[PDB]
Amino acid sequence: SNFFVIKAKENGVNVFGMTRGTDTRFHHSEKLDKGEVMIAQFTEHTSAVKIRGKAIIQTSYGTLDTEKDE
Amino acid sequence: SNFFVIKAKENGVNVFGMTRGTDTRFHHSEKLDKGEVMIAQFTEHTSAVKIRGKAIIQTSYGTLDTEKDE
Amino acid sequence: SNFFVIKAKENGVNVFGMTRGTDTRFHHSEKLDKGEVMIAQFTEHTSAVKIRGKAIIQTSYGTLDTEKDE
Amino acid sequence: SNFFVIKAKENGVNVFGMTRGTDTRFHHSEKLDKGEVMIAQFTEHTSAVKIRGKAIIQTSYGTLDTEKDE
Amino acid sequence: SNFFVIKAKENGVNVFGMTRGTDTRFHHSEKLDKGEVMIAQFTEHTSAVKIRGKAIIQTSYGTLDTEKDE
Amino acid sequence: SNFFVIKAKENGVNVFGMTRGTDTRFHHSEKLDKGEVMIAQFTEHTSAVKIRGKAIIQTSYGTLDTEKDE
Amino acid sequence: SNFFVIKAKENGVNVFGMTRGTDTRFHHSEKLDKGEVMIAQFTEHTSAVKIRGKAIIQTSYGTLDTEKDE
Amino acid sequence: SNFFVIKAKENGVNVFGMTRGTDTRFHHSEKLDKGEVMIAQFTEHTSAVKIRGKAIIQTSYGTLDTEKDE
Amino acid sequence: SNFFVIKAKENGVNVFGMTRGTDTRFHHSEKLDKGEVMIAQFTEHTSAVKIRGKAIIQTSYGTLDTEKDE
Amino acid sequence: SNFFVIKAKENGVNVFGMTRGTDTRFHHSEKLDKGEVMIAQFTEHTSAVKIRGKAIIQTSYGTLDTEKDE
Amino acid sequence: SNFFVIKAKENGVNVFGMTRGTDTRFHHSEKLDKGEVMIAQFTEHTSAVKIRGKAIIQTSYGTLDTEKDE
Amino acid sequence: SNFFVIKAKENGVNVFGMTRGTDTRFHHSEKLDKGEVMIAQFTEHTSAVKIRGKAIIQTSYGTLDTEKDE
Ligand SMILES: N[C@@H](Cc1c[nH]c2ccccc12)C(=O)O
Ligand SMILES: N[C@@H](Cc1c[nH]c2ccccc12)C(=O)O
Ligand SMILES: N[C@@H](Cc1c[nH]c2ccccc12)C(=O)O
Ligand SMILES: N[C@@H](Cc1c[nH]c2ccccc12)C(=O)O
Ligand SMILES: N[C@@H](Cc1c[nH]c2ccccc12)C(=O)O
Ligand SMILES: N[C@@H](Cc1c[nH]c2ccccc12)C(=O)O
Ligand SMILES: N[C@@H](Cc1c[nH]c2ccccc12)C(=O)O
Ligand SMILES: N[C@@H](Cc1c[nH]c2ccccc12)C(=O)O
Ligand SMILES: N[C@@H](Cc1c[nH]c2ccccc12)C(=O)O
Ligand SMILES: N[C@@H](Cc1c[nH]c2ccccc12)C(=O)O
Ligand SMILES: N[C@@H](Cc1c[nH]c2ccccc12)C(=O)O
Ligand SMILES: N[C@@H](Cc1c[nH]c2ccccc12)C(=O)O
Ligand SMILES: N[C@@H](Cc1c[nH]c2ccccc12)C(=O)O
Ligand SMILES: N[C@@H](Cc1c[nH]c2ccccc12)C(=O)O
Ligand SMILES: N[C@@H](Cc1c[nH]c2ccccc12)C(=O)O
Ligand SMILES: N[C@@H](Cc1c[nH]c2ccccc12)C(=O)O
Ligand SMILES: N[C@@H](Cc1c[nH]c2ccccc12)C(=O)O
Ligand SMILES: N[C@@H](Cc1c[nH]c2ccccc12)C(=O)O
Ligand SMILES: N[C@@H](Cc1c[nH]c2ccccc12)C(=O)O
Ligand SMILES: N[C@@H](Cc1c[nH]c2ccccc12)C(=O)O
Ligand SMILES: N[C@@H](Cc1c[nH]c2ccccc12)C(=O)O
Ligand SMILES: N[C@@H](Cc1c[nH]c2ccccc12)C(=O)O
Ligand SMILES: N[C@@H](Cc1c[nH]c2ccccc12)C(=O)O
Ligand SMILES: N[C@@H](Cc1c[nH]c2ccccc12)C(=O)O
User: How many CB atoms neighbour CB K68 within 10 A?
Assistant: First the structure.
């Protein structure tokens, strides 16, 4: 039931899915062009993700901007 | 059980369903003309979606506008 | 247990039910004339819907108006 | 447990029950005269309803008036 | 488990219980004189009700007055 | 687990229990004199009640007064 | 888990337990003198109670005074 | 799992446990001197309690003072 | 899963555990000197406690002070 | 799932774990020096704790200071 | 179902996964360059994580900044 | 499922995991340099932790600063 939203602020965003289990590798990379949105769950096969590029990210904890200086 | 809403702001918005499981591919593409709405769940077969085009997207985290510059 | 409400703002509204499973196709189209309302669930057979025409749409995320310039 | 309330604002309201399952047909039509109220659940046999005529409709998401211009 | 309240504002308010299942019929009629109250559940046998007459009706969505013109 | 409270405002109040199942009839009538209170559950045997007389009635939806001009 | 509290405002309060099941009879009467408090549950054997005399009564729905004029 | 708190305002406050089941009797009496506190649950053996004496009583409904005149 | 907290305001505080079941007796007494704190659960073996001495007592219903003139 | 936090305000704090079951004895003492923190659960083996020394204690019910005069 | 978010404030951030069970060791290290984000769950294999570098960290308890002088 | 956060305010903060079960011992020590963060659960093997050093600690009860004098 846990899910997250990624919106690409610019071209060049990638979302990597990381394998659930003893081993940790990237099993999929989804590219996002500017304006594209991926809505994705954690699943049997995906227990972590890594996001690269200029993006807005939403989870239960709020909205995160990758370009912002905190 | 988790579900999301997509309303097209222009013709040709495209909603791709991504397969649940070890493999990740687009198993379905649903196009939306301006003003059309898709309401869709995550399911046994669909564990992520990719959306392209000028659209309003709603999840339990709130409403996103794909056009908005952050 | 998730349900949605559609009210036709004008004649010509259609609600398509999309099949649950590996196969995705329309299994039903319900036509709504001005003012008519459909209240419908996601179900064993329906895991997504597509709505066409000038309509008010309600989900747990709130009320959408297809005609609104967003 | 999901239920809805319909109050007829005038004579000529009908509430159609739509069959749950692979097939979608109207299995019952209940007529409401002005002032009459139907309170009804979704059930094993009913997974969607269609409402016609001048009516006030209540669900979890609020109260809807079929005659109103949104 | 879902339940509703009906208070008669006049004599001869009538509460019809509608059968759960494939068939839909009135299996019981309970009449209420002015000020009398019925508190009733949905059950194995009752999946909808139809109410006629001047009455106050309460559900988890709030209080409805059958006389009020909207 | 749903329960209701009835307080008699005057002598002459009666609380009828209505049988659960295909058959609907009164299986019990409890008389309340002024000020007396009944607190009762819905149960295996009771799926609806009817209240007659001048009474204060409490459910999870709030407090009703049978004598009130609504 | 459903429970209620009775405090006697004066001598002469009685709390009657009513039998759960097909039959409805008083299986116990507990007398309360002024100031005494009974805290009691609904149970396998008790599905309703009747309270007589001058008392303060508390349930989930609030506090009720038997002597008050509503 | 439901529990209650009793603090004595005077010596000789008395807490009687009432048996769960078909029979209702006091199976235990616990006396409290001024300022002493009992925190007790309802249990397999105890489905009601009777309290006599000047005391503060707390339940999930709030705090009661047995001395207070209403 | 219910727990309680006792802080000794002065030397001489005692917390008695009362046995769960048909038999009710003290199975343990824990002595607390000034400032010492006990945090304890209800359990398979303990269904009530009695607290003696000058103490601050905390439950989900709030904080009590045994020395307070109520 | 029930847990508590202890922070030592000064050297000389001890946290005693009390055995769950028919018998009640201290099965472990953990010493805390000034500034050290113990976060601990209730468990199969621990159903109560006793805390000695100058400490800040946190539970669901709030923060308690052992040195404070209430 | 608990998850956490890590955003790298600068290059050089590392997220170590710590093994669940009797054995505790690092089974994975994910490196994050400036702006990159990891969203990850606790899992069958990971019961703790250690984060090194200049990072924004989000959990259900809120947002932490590793560089902040606390 | 319960989890906690520890951020080091100085080098050499030390987090000791304490064994679940009849025996209580430190089964693991994780040291943190200034700014490093551990996010950790209670588990089958870990039912308490002991933390030494200048640190910010977060639980569902709030944030604690080990340096703060109360
Ligand atoms: N294979 C790892 C992936 C992972 C999840 N959460 C992590 C946190 C840190 C490092 C790796 C992970 C797992 O399922 O446990
Ligand atoms: N429901 C899990 C993810 C998940 C789905 N199927 C699974 C099977 C095994 C392990 C985890 C999962 C979550 O929200 O976090
Ligand atoms: N209920 C899941 C989706 C889902 C439905 N059927 C499934 C079967 C297997 C795995 C996941 C699912 C969710 O809301 O996220
Ligand atoms: N087949 C993948 C699809 C997926 C879900 N969430 C993801 C996040 C990142 C990359 C891929 C995914 C899965 O079910 O796990
Ligand atoms: N047959 C698809 C229908 C579907 C649900 N959600 C979707 C999102 C995108 C595309 C298709 C879908 C399924 O049950 O999984
Ligand atoms: N409750 C499901 C829909 C549903 C009903 N019956 C089903 C049987 C199989 C799969 C899904 C369903 C949902 O909202 O997601
Ligand atoms: N027979 C369909 C009825 C239905 C429910 N929800 C729908 C949404 C759109 C179209 C039809 C429906 C079903 O049970 O799935
Ligand atoms: N409880 C379901 C409706 C329902 C009742 N019985 C059913 C049997 C099968 C499928 C659905 C149902 C709901 O609220 O939505
Ligand atoms: N509990 C259901 C009604 C109900 C009771 N018994 C049933 C048996 C079958 C189907 C429904 C029911 C509700 O609140 O809506
Ligand atoms: N026999 C129908 C009664 C019913 C319930 N909800 C309805 C809505 C519309 C029409 C009929 C109904 C059923 O149990 O499904
Ligand atoms: N015997 C009916 C009693 C009943 C409950 N709710 C009702 C509503 C209307 C009419 C009768 C009823 C039943 O158990 O279903
Ligand atoms: N808990 C049910 C009433 C009830 C108790 N026991 C029952 C046995 C069968 C049917 C209903 C019941 C309700 O409030 O709706
Ligand atoms: N023997 C009845 C007692 C009862 C409970 N609620 C009632 C309401 C009205 C009349 C009687 C009752 C029963 O268990 O069902
Ligand atoms: N737990 C029920 C009462 C109850 C206890 N044991 C029971 C056994 C049978 C029926 C009801 C009960 C309530 O709070 O309402
Ligand atoms: N858990 C019940 C009391 C209880 C405990 N054990 C029981 C065994 C039988 C009946 C009731 C009980 C309550 O909080 O009210
Ligand atoms: N033996 C009775 C005790 C009781 C509980 N609640 C009551 C209310 C009134 C009278 C007696 C009781 C029972 O378990 O049911
Ligand atoms: N042995 C009694 C102890 C008890 C619990 N709650 C009580 C209230 C009053 C008197 C005694 C008790 C029991 O388990 O039931
Ligand atoms: N969780 C129970 C106490 C308890 C723990 N283990 C038990 C075993 C039997 C009876 C009660 C218990 C309560 O708070 O009421
Ligand atoms: N061995 C006791 C310890 C205990 C828990 N709560 C208590 C309260 C008072 C006295 C002792 C205790 C038990 O598990 O029950
Ligand atoms: N989960 C219990 C403690 C506990 C863990 N394992 C247990 C085994 C038996 C009894 C109690 C426990 C609590 O939070 O209170
Ligand atoms: N292997 C340890 C890892 C761990 C989790 N939480 C901890 C807290 C402190 C030290 C180690 C840990 C465990 O699963 O229990
Ligand atoms: N849901 C667990 C993590 C988890 C997933 N699968 C597991 C299998 C075994 C143990 C733990 C897990 C938690 O957050 O604590
Ligand atoms: N879920 C427990 C910890 C836990 C995980 N696996 C366990 C196995 C046995 C006992 C406890 C556990 C908690 O949050 O506190
Ligand atoms: N081995 C102990 C560890 C522990 C948990 N909570 C405690 C509180 C005090 C002392 C020790 C502990 C246990 O699992 O129970």
Answer: 12
